[PDB]
């Protein structure tokens, strides 16, 4: 129909009785889900989508800031101007699926093209009230608990020729990953388990898809070049605790066809994504902390400058969580029906 | 006279096939086993297998079993080698060679054919003159820029001029495209007197150039 | 499984050059492969000299130990030498010549008006017929050093006069190119007592 | 006493772009230059005037504060959402002819009982329709001493409206550009600590032999668990953990706030979404003139009676201003 920008509303299945933080935020923020939604296919039609200029992405970012403002309150928040102390309550933390919905007079177009690269024309289109359920999972390097590509791996970037612009990868087959900090030893020490055969195969498939976009070059995977730890490690939050995981064993040109162990630390001193600054959080809760997650996508950064061995080097990256939302919101735009 | 002539250099996308042909002249083709040997850039020689032209019967190295096919057409004295499911490490020069005796002495080799396994895509060279104004021996040449894949051959004056020619190895640019120079030192007296043309041939794109190099 | 020693060796013209191959016997054949060409069979059945090959090359064997000899190394003998038994081939021995220091001739080439009209500028410096192989070219624009701007390439050792030649290539956009006037390359070699500099005006 | 339709008058200016003026001119007649007070049993909890004003304030907001989306179970509604200049202006609600408005001049009327010093006036004083929870803003203060008002103090389910002797200042600000939703409130810890004891003291008079404790909200809608209000058209929600605290700081007190686009409406059951906040510095300096408290039920542990902020029913806000007024035929 007609592209337009407005204020969408969120719907979720949060429960008023549930003490978990995503629920608590959503019960106020969001209305309930429609049990039977109406999707109207357009047969042959063409619309242009731009995942990189999508007002829906910017809305989820402001939303996830609002969630974390309530869930994850740090003991000390450091800003260049100031240092601040506040209450540090531990909380129950498990991301729950969020739907973003169009109000009256507006609709959300959904691209059904099975392998849309995300900026350009869409062949198959439908109109919906709401997006699918998107879990606001904050993470770097590996994209977790998201949606998979229907047909084949897709590579998405604002400018592939520009090395500085992040690469969002969508996988064909998800790979399981389990990170656990066992019950009490070093209470900050943790580990992650990955099937090397499954991850090694996943890598080749993305490497092969990458080679199509750089036909000249050979494709190398390597450990992060450097920067803030949030980015140089696979960083995420599990049960309110911030995990930082060594993915040197993941981004390697020679990967083990065996079970892979990644070392992790629970960190109290972190760099915020929400704003530039540093936060200090409370020491971990007691007991077993575990996350069994689905790796469904990647965030990569390609090395700049002249290639030494006619090799293009790609290293895990991240940091701007909007890209995380783009990995899910690429196929939607808001249009005002007339 | 006694010779093996192979097909020209190739580029093929990964996962594709390449066929190399080898045509033998000046001996009885049926008499000797024909072998294929490949050589990756900068590396040593790797035997691929042999074919008996009487039988058409083959023997392939285990490394290539199920990927290589050796056939022959005794009617035109031609042996064929076909490698399937190419992978980038299959980029190499392929040679046909005659086994002279059961010493495995390969007395006769083809000039060898380069096979670049690569997803894309052929580009003809731009050929720019390297004019000479400096001085009793003057240097001139040809810049053969931005072509793909290897190889290009350069001669001067359609082969008449050979003394003092240096065709450099190609360097692989940051663009993935190759580039090389061919130069020649000539008598300075020659520069007004004599025409200088470099002949650049890039068969993978069927690009052929004659470029007069002017003061 | 095939061994070969040494990997490479330098030798003066006329020297006695000996190569060793380590493998039961028989049979053992020796090949010479020059740059860009196919192998050429020299020695077959360990000791037998192929027809039409100079008498200076020879081979010897005992058991599973073999050797290949050039009695008097000549300039055209720059090549790699391979032993082989049936399918298996040794990693090869690279033989290059040692010679008296030779200074390079130096020439520099402005970018062509052809290339300019397309928007890029390649400047080329030539080092011609020098020895040893070691050489150092650095680019100056208007007295300004450059880095990552250029690529260079070296010929194989010359079969007649045993020298090398070297090409160094300066590439930059037509925009940058016209933002300057004097383009120079500075060659440093053992043959040259003071480092030579060649240059021109845009 | 009779039930009728009063009419409102205000100091509205026809030229003013501020919305309370704009609504007031079409809705409201001018202030009477010459007011008459003529000296001569009430219920603030059963007063038709409150139900009238509530409709007015709904009406004000419908014209001033149109949310971009109104979310109701049946439906979504979308409408023009223009930002506006927002500063409540005092409204006088007046009796129609053949009717008069009685005024309690009583020194300390609890608001349910008999008033001795009564007067008749045509109009009520100017009341600002400040919509808020937990803290009462920009209203009227008690003349003599802090006043406790309830339908029943023995019934913990009935709200407690406290009217203050001496106002406490509160400044809430979103600084000029960081998280544009982030805001803060500044209150003098010394001023507030004294105020608490002076209200804690008054409370001990109704609950003898018990200690008086202040604690944070028990739970509910966010509107009620925080101190919520509108400042310059933007909706503030402020964490009063530092205010309802048995151990308040002598030092300066800073409350964390958020500017919220999604609110639960007090006008009706539903959710409204408003436009993102304006650019620039947003600040409200307000006078805290009263409290909305809820007393914990049950057998007392440690012999302490616990009180917590509450609200949500905006009628309770008007009852803090209309208590001394009754309509007569
Ligand atoms: C990607 O997505 C994946 C899936 O989509 C994510 O993986 C999911 O992760 C969530 C957790 O984030 C999992 O759900 C959780 O399961 C927890 C464990 O569930 C089992 O264990 C229960 C208890 O075990 C004992 O008791 C049973 C008797 O019933 C006995 O058999 C057993 O042997 C053992 O002794 C068991 O009863 C269950 O049925 C399961 O077997 C489960 O405990 C979690 O419940 C949490 O959270 C929920 C809300 O999510 C609450 O309703 C619960 O009360 C409980 O919360 C407690 O923990 C909080 C944090 O510590 C507290 O602060 C809470 O207030 C609460 O604490 C109370 O309860 C404690 C007693 O348990 C008391 O000690 C306290 O004082 C409080 O009373 C939850 O259901 C999914 O299982 C999992 N899915 C998969 C497929 O694995 C993954 O996380 C995602 N990754 C990312 C990055 O997003
Ligand atoms: C309480 O009343 C005063 C006005 O009586 C309000 O102060 C106004 O504040 C706005 C911005 O907040 C300013 O732009 C106006 O200039 C002020 N007007 C006056 C008359 O001072 C104050 O904001 C009110 N507080 C609340 C919570 O509504
Ligand atoms: C802020 O408010 C929330 C709920 O409104 C509450 O849980 C939290 O404890 C408050 N802040 C502090 C410091 O307690
Ligand atoms: C998944 O996509 C890849 C392309 O990256 C393709 O090679 C692979 O066969 C696909 N497999 C399935 C099951 O979709
Ligand atoms: C672990 O990560 C660190 C920092 O993120 C990195 O320097 C290191 O190389 C990784 N592990 C190993 C074994 O190198
Ligand atoms: C990482 O690389 C090294 C070699 O570089 C290898 O030995 C190691 O097993 C690799 N690990 C994984 C998990 O890929
Ligand atoms: C198995 O592991 C080796 C490295 O140990 C690797 O080279 C090979 O490709 C792997 N193959 C599969 C099918 O995982
Ligand atoms: C205000 O009232 C309180 C009790 O309600 C009393 O303690 C205080 O003295 C009074 N102050 C003034 C100035 O009237
Ligand atoms: C509120 O009380 C908590 C502890 O109960 C204390 O840490 C905090 O400083 C108090 N805040 C104020 C403003 O008194």
GROMACS .gro file of N, CA and C in nm, chain C residues 107-171:
model
  195
  660UNK      N    1   6.513   0.288  -1.488
  660UNK     CA    2   6.426   0.362  -1.577
  660UNK      C    3   6.293   0.383  -1.507
  661UNK      N    4   6.228   0.495  -1.537
  661UNK     CA    5   6.100   0.528  -1.477
  661UNK      C    6   6.003   0.571  -1.585
  662UNK      N    7   5.876   0.535  -1.565
  662UNK     CA    8   5.773   0.550  -1.667
  662UNK      C    9   5.653   0.629  -1.613
  663UNK      N   10   5.618   0.741  -1.676
  663UNK     CA   11   5.499   0.815  -1.637
  663UNK      C   12   5.373   0.743  -1.677
  664UNK      N   13   5.263   0.768  -1.609
  664UNK     CA   14   5.136   0.709  -1.650
  664UNK      C   15   5.095   0.762  -1.785
  665UNK      N   16   5.026   0.677  -1.861
  665UNK     CA   17   4.991   0.713  -1.998
  665UNK      C   18   4.868   0.804  -2.002
  666UNK      N   19   4.861   0.886  -2.108
  666UNK     CA   20   4.739   0.963  -2.132
  666UNK      C   21   4.620   0.870  -2.153
  667UNK      N   22   4.642   0.751  -2.211
  667UNK     CA   23   4.534   0.652  -2.216
  667UNK      C   24   4.481   0.624  -2.076
  668UNK      N   25   4.569   0.593  -1.983
  668UNK     CA   26   4.522   0.547  -1.853
  668UNK      C   27   4.458   0.661  -1.776
  669UNK      N   28   4.507   0.783  -1.800
  669UNK     CA   29   4.457   0.897  -1.726
  669UNK      C   30   4.309   0.919  -1.755
  670UNK      N   31   4.272   0.912  -1.882
  670UNK     CA   32   4.136   0.938  -1.925
  670UNK      C   33   4.038   0.844  -1.858
  671UNK      N   34   4.085   0.730  -1.807
  671UNK     CA   35   4.005   0.634  -1.731
  671UNK      C   36   4.010   0.657  -1.580
  672UNK      N   37   4.098   0.742  -1.530
  672UNK     CA   38   4.087   0.784  -1.392
  672UNK      C   39   4.181   0.718  -1.294
  673UNK      N   40   4.277   0.642  -1.341
  673UNK     CA   41   4.380   0.589  -1.253
  673UNK      C   42   4.517   0.618  -1.313
  674UNK      N   43   4.619   0.618  -1.226
  674UNK     CA   44   4.757   0.653  -1.262
  674UNK      C   45   4.852   0.551  -1.202
  675UNK      N   46   4.921   0.479  -1.290
  675UNK     CA   47   5.022   0.382  -1.252
  675UNK      C   48   5.156   0.437  -1.295
  676UNK      N   49   5.247   0.444  -1.201
  676UNK     CA   50   5.383   0.485  -1.227
  676UNK      C   51   5.470   0.364  -1.200
  677UNK      N   52   5.571   0.346  -1.284
  677UNK     CA   53   5.649   0.222  -1.291
  677UNK      C   54   5.797   0.254  -1.292
  678UNK      N   55   5.869   0.188  -1.202
  678UNK     CA   56   6.014   0.196  -1.191
  678UNK      C   57   6.073   0.061  -1.228
  679UNK      N   58   6.179   0.062  -1.308
  679UNK     CA   59   6.242  -0.060  -1.357
  679UNK      C   60   6.385  -0.070  -1.308
  680UNK      N   61   6.418  -0.185  -1.252
  680UNK     CA   62   6.553  -0.224  -1.217
  680UNK      C   63   6.595  -0.339  -1.308
  681UNK      N   64   6.700  -0.316  -1.386
  681UNK     CA   65   6.732  -0.399  -1.500
  681UNK      C   66   6.867  -0.469  -1.485
  682UNK      N   67   6.864  -0.602  -1.481
  682UNK     CA   68   6.986  -0.682  -1.493
  682UNK      C   69   7.085  -0.648  -1.381
  683UNK      N   70   7.055  -0.700  -1.263
  683UNK     CA   71   7.138  -0.677  -1.147
  683UNK      C   72   7.159  -0.804  -1.065
  684UNK      N   73   7.256  -0.800  -0.975
  684UNK     CA   74   7.282  -0.913  -0.887
  684UNK      C   75   7.354  -0.855  -0.772
  685UNK      N   76   7.336  -0.910  -0.651
  685UNK     CA   77   7.243  -1.017  -0.615
  685UNK      C   78   7.099  -0.971  -0.624
  686UNK      N   79   7.011  -1.066  -0.585
  686UNK     CA   80   6.865  -1.051  -0.595
  686UNK      C   81   6.813  -0.942  -0.503
  687UNK      N   82   6.875  -0.930  -0.384
  687UNK     CA   83   6.839  -0.832  -0.284
  687UNK      C   84   6.843  -0.692  -0.345
  688UNK      N   85   6.738  -0.616  -0.321
  688UNK     CA   86   6.727  -0.482  -0.375
  688UNK      C   87   6.620  -0.406  -0.299
  689UNK      N   88   6.630  -0.273  -0.298
  689UNK     CA   89   6.539  -0.190  -0.220
  689UNK      C   90   6.502  -0.067  -0.302
  690UNK      N   91   6.374  -0.060  -0.340
  690UNK     CA   92   6.315   0.054  -0.410
  690UNK      C   93   6.213   0.113  -0.314
  691UNK      N   94   6.218   0.245  -0.297
  691UNK     CA   95   6.120   0.322  -0.221
  691UNK      C   96   6.081   0.443  -0.306
  692UNK      N   97   5.952   0.480  -0.299
  692UNK     CA   98   5.890   0.580  -0.385
  692UNK      C   99   5.888   0.714  -0.312
  693UNK      N  100   5.924   0.820  -0.385
  693UNK     CA  101   5.914   0.956  -0.336
  693UNK      C  102   5.824   1.035  -0.431
  694UNK      N  103   5.728   1.105  -0.374
  694UNK     CA  104   5.649   1.205  -0.445
  694UNK      C  105   5.675   1.339  -0.377
  695UNK      N  106   5.731   1.434  -0.452
  695UNK     CA  107   5.752   1.567  -0.398
  695UNK      C  108   5.821   1.555  -0.262
  696UNK      N  109   5.923   1.469  -0.257
  696UNK     CA  110   6.007   1.444  -0.139
  696UNK      C  111   5.930   1.366  -0.032
  697UNK      N  112   5.812   1.313  -0.065
  697UNK     CA  113   5.729   1.243   0.031
  697UNK      C  114   5.732   1.093   0.008
  698UNK      N  115   5.776   1.019   0.109
  698UNK     CA  116   5.777   0.873   0.105
  698UNK      C  117   5.633   0.821   0.097
  699UNK      N  118   5.617   0.699   0.045
  699UNK     CA  119   5.489   0.634   0.034
  699UNK      C  120   5.500   0.494   0.090
  700UNK      N  121   5.387   0.442   0.137
  700UNK     CA  122   5.378   0.307   0.190
  700UNK      C  123   5.243   0.249   0.151
  701UNK      N  124   5.241   0.117   0.126
  701UNK     CA  125   5.124   0.046   0.077
  701UNK      C  126   5.074   0.092  -0.058
  702UNK      N  127   5.142   0.188  -0.122
  702UNK     CA  128   5.101   0.247  -0.250
  702UNK      C  129   5.135   0.160  -0.372
  703UNK      N  130   5.236   0.074  -0.358
  703UNK     CA  131   5.304   0.012  -0.469
  703UNK      C  132   5.311  -0.138  -0.443
  704UNK      N  133   5.325  -0.213  -0.555
  704UNK     CA  134   5.358  -0.356  -0.563
  704UNK      C  135   5.482  -0.375  -0.652
  705UNK      N  136   5.558  -0.482  -0.625
  705UNK     CA  137   5.676  -0.511  -0.705
  705UNK      C  138   5.682  -0.659  -0.740
  706UNK      N  139   5.758  -0.688  -0.847
  706UNK     CA  140   5.766  -0.821  -0.904
  706UNK      C  141   5.905  -0.843  -0.963
  707UNK      N  142   5.955  -0.965  -0.946
  707UNK     CA  143   6.092  -0.998  -0.984
  707UNK      C  144   6.094  -1.110  -1.088
  708UNK      N  145   6.179  -1.095  -1.189
  708UNK     CA  146   6.194  -1.207  -1.280
  708UNK      C  147   6.266  -1.324  -1.214
  709UNK      N  148   6.259  -1.439  -1.283
  709UNK     CA  149   6.346  -1.551  -1.253
  709UNK      C  150   6.486  -1.516  -1.299
  710UNK      N  151   6.582  -1.586  -1.240
  710UNK     CA  152   6.722  -1.562  -1.270
  710UNK      C  153   6.752  -1.589  -1.417
  711UNK      N  154   6.826  -1.498  -1.479
  711UNK     CA  155   6.847  -1.503  -1.623
  711UNK      C  156   6.944  -1.614  -1.664
  712UNK      N  157   6.906  -1.684  -1.769
  712UNK     CA  158   6.977  -1.806  -1.803
  712UNK      C  159   7.109  -1.780  -1.873
  713UNK      N  160   7.127  -1.661  -1.931
  713UNK     CA  161   7.249  -1.628  -2.003
  713UNK      C  162   7.346  -1.557  -1.911
  714UNK      N  163   7.300  -1.449  -1.849
  714UNK     CA  164   7.386  -1.361  -1.770
  714UNK      C  165   7.354  -1.363  -1.622
  715UNK      N  166   7.267  -1.452  -1.577
  715UNK     CA  167   7.247  -1.481  -1.436
  715UNK      C  168   7.200  -1.361  -1.353
  716UNK      N  169   7.152  -1.253  -1.416
  716UNK     CA  170   7.102  -1.137  -1.343
  716UNK      C  171   6.954  -1.150  -1.308
  717UNK      N  172   6.906  -1.052  -1.233
  717UNK     CA  173   6.764  -1.035  -1.211
  717UNK      C  174   6.716  -0.900  -1.264
  718UNK      N  175   6.586  -0.892  -1.280
  718UNK     CA  176   6.521  -0.765  -1.308
  718UNK      C  177   6.403  -0.753  -1.212
  719UNK      N  178   6.365  -0.628  -1.184
  719UNK     CA  179   6.266  -0.601  -1.082
  719UNK      C  180   6.181  -0.485  -1.129
  720UNK      N  181   6.051  -0.498  -1.109
  720UNK     CA  182   5.953  -0.395  -1.139
  720UNK      C  183   5.883  -0.357  -1.011
  721UNK      N  184   5.872  -0.226  -0.985
  721UNK     CA  185   5.795  -0.171  -0.873
  721UNK      C  186   5.692  -0.074  -0.930
  722UNK      N  187   5.566  -0.088  -0.889
  722UNK     CA  188   5.456  -0.016  -0.954
  722UNK      C  189   5.376   0.071  -0.858
  723UNK      N  190   5.370   0.200  -0.888
  723UNK     CA  191   5.300   0.295  -0.805
  723UNK      C  192   5.162   0.322  -0.865
  724UNK      N  193   5.059   0.300  -0.785
  724UNK     CA  194   4.923   0.318  -0.832
  724UNK      C  195   4.856   0.418  -0.739
   0.00000   0.00000   0.00000
